[PDB]
Structure 1
Amino acid sequence: NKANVCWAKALVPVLKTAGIDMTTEQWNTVDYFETDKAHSAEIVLNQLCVRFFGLDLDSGLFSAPTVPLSIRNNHWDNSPSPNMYGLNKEVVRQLSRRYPQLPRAVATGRVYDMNTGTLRNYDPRINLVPVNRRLPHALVLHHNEHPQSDFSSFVSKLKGRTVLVVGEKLSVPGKMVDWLSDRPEATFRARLDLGIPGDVPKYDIIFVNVRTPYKYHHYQQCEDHAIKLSMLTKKACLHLNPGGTCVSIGYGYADRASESIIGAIARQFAFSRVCKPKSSLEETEVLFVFIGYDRAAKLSSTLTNIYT
């Protein structure tokens, strides 16, 4: 759906409107570029917008109708469509009152360092959080290295007979488990960057056992995970028996894409909860728990309590 190939090529003319010309070395700081995976050009544009200018796309910085970002035949491209992006000079003028060197940054493809108000060359560690965004929940400021969590016990306690585990292998005592992964021993072997295959069956429980590494900040970890929520967790709703359950590893919804994705998933289930079991030691990691698919019968406040 939102992940398609050639997203980096499609972004070249968009980024050029802000003076940005990415080298291979700079593209390699986008994880899916280095590993050659399908991605959303919009999520990547948002990531680069924060890295370069300290503002996310909701600032309007790229809202001019200059270059299309379109999805055609599983590719991102610049074919005509209403979904157009480009440096918006009127927005730059408005922001320059608060950020006086920002017009120079967007003319020359330099980083505007939000900590100093001065220009820098590209480094992904300079601007870690979009200063324009009202975060829906508190973020972890002090992350530590911990052993990986083991969610076998959690899934075993869920109600349901059939389980689809997506991502890394997970045994679930007492249930019948199918495993979707790009590993050779998977039940269904597929590239996970292309999402849950449409021909996968329906299940009582889907557990998205997929993690994203912490590199610079909770915000980075969340935005890097958003595409996985879009291609895996969001597609789980097509693969659930009536009243079924989806559980997914996540990191909250620090970024705009994750917030939209999680909200859309939650509206399809009777109950939505965030849980942090005892085996989950990494400070940013949570489980999103969606109970009662296609049935009727605080998320942000729970995340704030977990992450404060």
Structure 2
Amino acid sequence: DVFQNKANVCWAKALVPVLKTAGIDMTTEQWNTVDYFETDKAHSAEIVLNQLCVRFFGLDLDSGLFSAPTVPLSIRNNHWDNSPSPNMYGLNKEVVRQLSRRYPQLPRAVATGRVYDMNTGTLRNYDPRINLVPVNRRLPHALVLHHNEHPQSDFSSFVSKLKGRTVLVVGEKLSVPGKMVDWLSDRPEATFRARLDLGIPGDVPKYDIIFVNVRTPYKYHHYQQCEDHAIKLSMLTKKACLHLNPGGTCVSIGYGYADRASESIIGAIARQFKFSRVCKPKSSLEETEVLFVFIGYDRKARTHNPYKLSSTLTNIYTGS
């Protein structure tokens, strides 16, 4: 009803009873501020929950604010529902009590379904721009000071320069001279034509190089753009690993890993390759944009290179 004309928002439906525990009752207009709701695309109910928790209460899920085992979020088939399951969520009152020490007005917000404004300590009506960043989370790298309006980047040259015979370009079209290029996209010209919100089709083959040429809109904050891109990291970039030949390379547009999902996904991917780099070629104009470069798909157990990518992101984003 709130959901009329929507085919792929079962993730928003599964959330309804979860949000209701924090007094939250989303209108259609409020769901419209989640982009995959507006464009009616498949999404993770857990990433969405994290994102709403930030917007509402200035904290992400790691705070435990929704850790009560009240309502399950489950995936039967490939859609979300509330079918019985150990993966349970719900406003946790003990955590609210503990947090009210630092945020005395938070109990009121989770009772009202209003926003707890981290900047002012007061209540507010919903708007996605009040709590831009979760305050319980130590970001693992710096974020840009400024974001401007630049022309879209072109990575043809960068992909050409990579070792590899066969290339799968995912998302936007890219011509890559000297390489055999398959194009995966919902565009009708595509070599393999598919809905990308469903992820990489199991039926696509293996490649020496996969390029995820997918971007996410900057709307109002670096953190916002990085968290909106996360579902794409998971559905495309992470699945790309199952379509690499031994020693192949995965390359992906990105905005860092400010949010917890992205950080989890990038780590899962990085630990499968001999090398993990962050590059920002002289073609990447947008300030928040980077390429994640994973070379040497070998799935050998090695030691954790985590501060390397963070340092590099930090230097990039502060300009250093």
TM-score for both structures, normalised by structure 2:
0.94
Indicate the larger mover: 289-298 or 69-78.
Answer: 289-298
Shift of 1:141: 2.3
For residues 212-261 of structure 1, the C-alpha deviation after alignment (integer angstroms, 9 at most, x for no partner) is 00001000000000000000000011100000000000000000000000
Verify the 8 A CA contact 1:141 1:218 in the aligned structure 2: no
Verify the 8 A CA contact 1:4 1:40 in the aligned structure 2: no
Whole-angstrom CA distance in 1 between matches of 2:141 and 2:36: 27
For residues 113-149 of structure 1, the C-alpha deviation after alignment (integer angstroms, 9 at most, x for no partner) is 0000000000001000000000000011211110000
SS of 2:158 mapped into structure 1: helix
Q: Is 2:242 the partner of 1:232? A: no
| CA gap 1:207/1:303 in 2 versus in 1, 3 angstroms | same
Shift of 1:73: 1.3
| CA gap 1:13/1:113 in 2 versus in 1, 3 angstroms | same
Shift of 1:3: 13
Indicate the larger mover: 294-303 or 233-242.
Answer: 294-303
Whole-angstrom CA distance in 1 between matches of 2:41 and 2:72: 21
SS of 1:244 mapped into structure 2: strand
SS of 1:104 mapped into structure 2: helix
For residues 83-142 of structure 1, the C-alpha deviation after alignment (integer angstroms, 9 at most, x for no partner) is 000000000000001101100000010000000000000000100000000000001121
Verify the 8 A CA contact 2:167 2:210 in the aligned structure 1: yes
Verify the 8 A CA contact 1:274 1:303 in the aligned structure 2: yes
Verify the 8 A CA contact 2:226 2:256 in the aligned structure 1: yes
SS of 2:229 mapped into structure 1: helix
For residues 193-227 of structure 1, the C-alpha deviation after alignment (integer angstroms, 9 at most, x for no partner) is 00000000000000000000000100000000000
Whole-angstrom CA distance in 2 between matches of 1:2 and 1:250: 28
Verify the 8 A CA contact 1:164 1:207 in the aligned structure 2: yes
Verify the 8 A CA contact 2:9 2:37 in the aligned structure 1: no
Whole-angstrom CA distance in 2 between matches of 1:175 and 1:15: 49
| CA gap 1:273/1:257 in 2 versus in 1, 3 angstroms | same
SS of 1:127 mapped into structure 2: coil
Shift of 1:5: 4.9
Whole-angstrom CA distance in 1 between matches of 2:277 and 2:7: 26
Q: CA RMSD in A?
A: 2.2
For 1:101, the equivalent position in structure 2 comes to 105
For 1:194, the equivalent position in structure 2 comes to 198
Verify the 8 A CA contact 1:3 1:231 in the aligned structure 2: no
Shift of 1:296: 4.9
Verify the 8 A CA contact 1:270 1:297 in the aligned structure 2: no
Verify the 8 A CA contact 1:222 1:255 in the aligned structure 2: yes
For residues 144-173 of structure 1, the C-alpha deviation after alignment (integer angstroms, 9 at most, x for no partner) is 110000000000000001000000000001
1:50 to 51, 54, 65: 54
Whole-angstrom CA distance in 2 between matches of 1:150 and 1:240: 23
For 2:130, the equivalent position in structure 1 comes to 126
SS of 1:221 mapped into structure 2: helix
Shift of 1:297: 9.7
| CA gap 1:229/1:3 in 2 versus in 1, 3 angstroms | farther
Whole-angstrom CA distance in 2 between matches of 1:245 and 1:130: 33
Structure 2 stretches lacking a partner, 5+ long: 303-308
Shift of 1:295: 5.2
Question: Segments of 4+ in structure 1 off by > 3 A?
Answer: 1-5, 295-298
For 1:82, the equivalent position in structure 2 comes to 86
% identical equivalent positions: 99
Verify the 8 A CA contact 2:186 2:196 in the aligned structure 1: yes
Whole-angstrom CA distance in 2 between matches of 1:297 and 1:24: 47
Verify the 8 A CA contact 1:284 1:307 in the aligned structure 2: yes
Indicate the larger mover: 286-295 or 26-35.
Answer: 286-295
